[PDB]
């Protein structure tokens, strides 16, 4: 009888106004609470649908505006898509705002979804306890009943209960704080502004503060009170971003309270919600002494995502779920652009460039999915968050970024935020900025509509002859395509010391450039600042090995790092024989930059691992020899010590790790006197940080070493040290201890379910838990679909590192036999059919490849 039977809310009537009422029990772990809300319809409409999931409305009440007098109004709900309907006995008319105040009482969130609750021990045996509210993927239908649909913005106030000592917080800052009956405060907050029903914020804890508030901007990262003093680099972070995220944009922070809390749990979120930045516990705390570079490195990222959010994505809020990857893409692009332009020692560049490689590679397939795409029901909702597209947004942005002028691309963001801000917006509504920015209104921004809206990423071939380079385009394809306008960018140095550096753009599937001279080396996708694979002429790519073998500097550390994923990712799929790529990374030798040696290492080793699980056992030994040998000098100068370059300590972290896994060297020898050090001190004495997982790994595999370990991690209480020995507890060779951590972690008796995906993932990449961590997988499925969601990133997670190693058909028909057995709807999941594809093309590459390095001996 409901009438809106369209999943998309009513575009007629509209909220203007937001208050809140909510008494929390917590011990009772119920609650019940008053909303206010004021609604300005703007189309005559006798009916009135909103978001509602789950509570017990008592009375409903309509207000005419005329008078004091409310007005009993029948209540009907849909809950499928999760509405409830109001039928009003004043039709409504334009212009006439009304009153919208209901009663609900609930029961709060078992799960970390909506307004939740969890218990938590103390230093003392004192369960003390939290509750806090994550409703992004429209969960505030739940709660406060609403307008869940991220168009539908307004201003929020809100008044909760709580007891004295849990310090209540939330978006806005604090006003009133009275004294109630029963010993019960009722603290109060300001009204907020214009913004979205996801990004409100309730928090009801016992926390402490540490603030350090600047130029009119009061920051406060709040935590539970066993810290207040691990959260400073979060400060000393979070207030020199937001002096540079303001600066670019050329906005200020609309609020004047900034608060970054930290949820004593694991099983949180990292969310946005305006004024009260939700983190998780772990998430911000670093020691300058103790913790590792990468560690450094997630601190200072984290927040630069979450923080610039609260422009991009909070002000400026996309009306659907379509461009979900405007929010995210952005801030993740801005979490490395603001590092290169203050925190530049950092080098998180090659933590961009990684992601990026990663990302082309899942792209690459016929499972992806186009980044913009139609939205019309809640798992096509919750699918939208996956992590490939925030980042394939990230370099689509660096890419216009690269060819548009950089303060082009500022003078475009600050016109969109301004013009559209405080407002809902569409994704052209971005590209409509950067035609207006321009100089001509030429370069119209449909070149990025290519992109937005179909799967998959250019293969730009280029063949040169003179002084004419020619390119033809065409789609990454495995043994549609509606073109691509591609920034094409280049370099050449063909007289002797002549340097030119361009730019070009591709909008045919051929095209030639001018050379104005006769060139001899020419690359492209300068530092790969653009979301493409470079094919060259057989002769085109024999020119520039030549060269990392002579001066391999004249490009550029980013340069040379694109070239071997691309050339290596190509032999795979029988469009360049792969000795060429070893020819190519036989400069190795003579490379000081950490990103070139990274990538390879992964290449290197992806054969190696590959070729393991087969049985070639042999020749991956004499493989991983020959990259040794290469890079054998640059092992021999590393120090073990945590000095250097964040840059340099990642290669150290790296190189080292190769040499010990692979046995090489006297790498065995210095770890495990080491780790017998270490233990002798009942792990109270100081191992290098950035080497120190090599050396819990090495130890490991003696009886005495595992047994040591797994006393610690059930001990300390530093997360990341002790995640780091988790990983070495399952680097061991005795099957026995793997099944046991893998069971242990599934019923999460000595460890925590949630740690289960480290193992299953860990112990299948090493050859002697390969076929065990896909035998748990298939005979534990059930409790992995009851423990965890069908779709969760935890599953996807699973069976890719179950199975992305196997090669061979017989295996291949043993996956896609279990899961089409199990369930048609599990068989057309998006985590077995990228895995089935993956099995496939393992295949290709032996069939491609694998006799020619049998004979490379
Ligand atoms: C955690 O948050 C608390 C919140 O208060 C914060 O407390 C701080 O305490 C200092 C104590 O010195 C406050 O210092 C202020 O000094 C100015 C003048 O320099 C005063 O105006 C302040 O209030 C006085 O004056 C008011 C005049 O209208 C009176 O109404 C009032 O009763 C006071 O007499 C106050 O003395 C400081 O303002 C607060 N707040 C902050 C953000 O510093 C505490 O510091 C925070 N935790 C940490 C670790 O910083
Ligand atoms: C330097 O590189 C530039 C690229 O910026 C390139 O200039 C281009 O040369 C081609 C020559 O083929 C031009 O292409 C023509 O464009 C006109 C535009 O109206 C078309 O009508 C033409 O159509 C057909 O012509 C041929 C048959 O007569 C076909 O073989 C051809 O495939 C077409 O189907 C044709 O496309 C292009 O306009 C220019 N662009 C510019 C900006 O100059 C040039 O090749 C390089 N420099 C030199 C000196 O050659
Ligand atoms: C949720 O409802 C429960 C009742 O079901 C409330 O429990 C009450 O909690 C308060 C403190 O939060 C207790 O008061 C304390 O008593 C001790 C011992 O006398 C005293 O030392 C403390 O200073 C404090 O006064 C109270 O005893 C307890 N109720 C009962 C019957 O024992 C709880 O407060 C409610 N929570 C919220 C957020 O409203
Ligand atoms: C500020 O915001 C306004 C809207 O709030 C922007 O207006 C939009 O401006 C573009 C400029 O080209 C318009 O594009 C044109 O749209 C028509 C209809 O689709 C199309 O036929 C044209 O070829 C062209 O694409 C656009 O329609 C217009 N409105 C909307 C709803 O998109 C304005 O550009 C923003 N910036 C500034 C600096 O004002
Ligand atoms: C890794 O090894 C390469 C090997 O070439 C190093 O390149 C060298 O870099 C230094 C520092 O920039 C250059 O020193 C100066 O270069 C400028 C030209 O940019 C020149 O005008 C100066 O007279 C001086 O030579 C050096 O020239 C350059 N090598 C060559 C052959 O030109 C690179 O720096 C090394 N990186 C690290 C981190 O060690
Ligand atoms: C690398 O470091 C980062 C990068 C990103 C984040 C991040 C996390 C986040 O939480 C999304 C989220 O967890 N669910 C909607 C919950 C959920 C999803 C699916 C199924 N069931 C449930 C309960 N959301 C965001 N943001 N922010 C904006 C503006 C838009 C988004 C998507 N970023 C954290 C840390
Ligand atoms: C709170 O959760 C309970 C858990 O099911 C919801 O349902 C009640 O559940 C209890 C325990 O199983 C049953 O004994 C009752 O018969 C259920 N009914 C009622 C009326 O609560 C309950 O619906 C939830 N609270 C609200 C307000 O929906
Ligand atoms: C909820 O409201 C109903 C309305 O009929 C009332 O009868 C009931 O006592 C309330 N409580 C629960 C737990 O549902
Ligand atoms: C309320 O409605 C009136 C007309 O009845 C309209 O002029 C006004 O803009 C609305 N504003 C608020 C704040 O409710
Ligand atoms: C405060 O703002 C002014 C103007 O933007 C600027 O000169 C100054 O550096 C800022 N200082 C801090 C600490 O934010
Ligand atoms: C460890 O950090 C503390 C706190 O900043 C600092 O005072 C101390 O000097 C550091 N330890 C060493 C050995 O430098
Ligand atoms: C590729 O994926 C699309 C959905 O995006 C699907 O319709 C099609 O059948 C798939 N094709 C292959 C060969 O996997
Ligand atoms: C390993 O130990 C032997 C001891 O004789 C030594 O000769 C060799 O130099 C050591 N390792 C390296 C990397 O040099
Ligand atoms: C070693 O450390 C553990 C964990 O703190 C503790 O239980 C044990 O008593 C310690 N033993 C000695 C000899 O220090
Ligand atoms: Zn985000």
Known sequence: LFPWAQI???????????????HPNLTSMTFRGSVTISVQALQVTWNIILHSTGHNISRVTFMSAVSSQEKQAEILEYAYHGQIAIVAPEALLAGHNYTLKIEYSANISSSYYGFYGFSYTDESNEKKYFAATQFEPLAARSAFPCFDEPAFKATFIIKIIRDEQYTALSNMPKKSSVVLDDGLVQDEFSESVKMSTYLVA???????????????????????????????????????????????????????????VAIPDFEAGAMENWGLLTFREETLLYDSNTSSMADRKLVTKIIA???????????????????????????????????????????????????????????????????????????????????????????LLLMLKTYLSEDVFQHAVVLYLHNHSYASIQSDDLWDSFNEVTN????????????????????????????????????????????????????????????????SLLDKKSGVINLTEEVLWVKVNINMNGYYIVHYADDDWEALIHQLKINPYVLSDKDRANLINNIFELAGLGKVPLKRAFDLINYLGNENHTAPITEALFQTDLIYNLL???????????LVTRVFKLLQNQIQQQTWTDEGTPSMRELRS?????????????????????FDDWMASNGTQSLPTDVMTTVFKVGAKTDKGWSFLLGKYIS???????????????SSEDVRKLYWLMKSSLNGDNFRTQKLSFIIRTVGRHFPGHLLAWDFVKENWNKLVQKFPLGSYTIQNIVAGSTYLFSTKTHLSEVQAFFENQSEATFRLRCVQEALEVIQLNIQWMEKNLKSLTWWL
């Open 654 to 674: 790296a190189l080292l790790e190769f040499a010990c896994t692979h046995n090489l060297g006297n790498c065995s020898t210095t770890a495990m006197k080491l």
């Open 202 to 260: 309730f928090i009801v804890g016992e926390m402490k503060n540490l603030s350090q508030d600047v130029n009119g901007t009061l920051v406060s990262i709040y935590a539970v009170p066993e810290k207040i003093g691990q959260v400073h680099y979060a400060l000393e972070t979070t207030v020199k971003l937001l002096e540079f995220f303001q600066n670019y944009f050329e906005i200020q922070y609309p609020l004047k309270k900034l608060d970054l």
């Open 612 to 622: 393991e699980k087969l049985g070639y056992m042999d020749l991956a030994s004499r």
């Open 716 to 730: 300390i209480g530093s997360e990341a040290e002790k995640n780091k020995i988790l990983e070495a507890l399952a």
């Open 8 to 22: 998309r809310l009513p575009t007629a009537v509209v909220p203007l106004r937001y208050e809140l009422s909510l």
């Open 305 to 395: 995502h979450e923080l610039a959010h609260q422009w991009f994505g909070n002000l400026v809020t996309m009306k659907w779920w379509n461009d979900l990857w405007l929010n995210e893409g952005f801030a993740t692009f801005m979490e490395y652009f603001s590092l290169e332009k203050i925190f530049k020692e950092l080098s998180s560049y090659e933590d961009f460039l990684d992601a990026r490689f990663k990302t082309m590679k899942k792209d690459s397939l016929n499972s992806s999915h186009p980044i913009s795409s139609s939205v019309q029901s809640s798992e096509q909702i919750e699918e939208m968050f996956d992590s490939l597209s925030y980042f394939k947004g990230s370099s």
């Open 440 to 503: 001509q209104t030429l370069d119209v921004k449909r070149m990025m509509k290519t992109w937005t809206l179909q799967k998959g990423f250019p293969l730009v071939t280029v063949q040169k002859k003179g002084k004419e380079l020619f390119i033809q385009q065409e789609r990454f394809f495995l043994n549609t395509s509606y073109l691509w306008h591609i920034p094409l960018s280049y370099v050449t140095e063909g007289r002797n010391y002549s340097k030119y550096q361009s730019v």
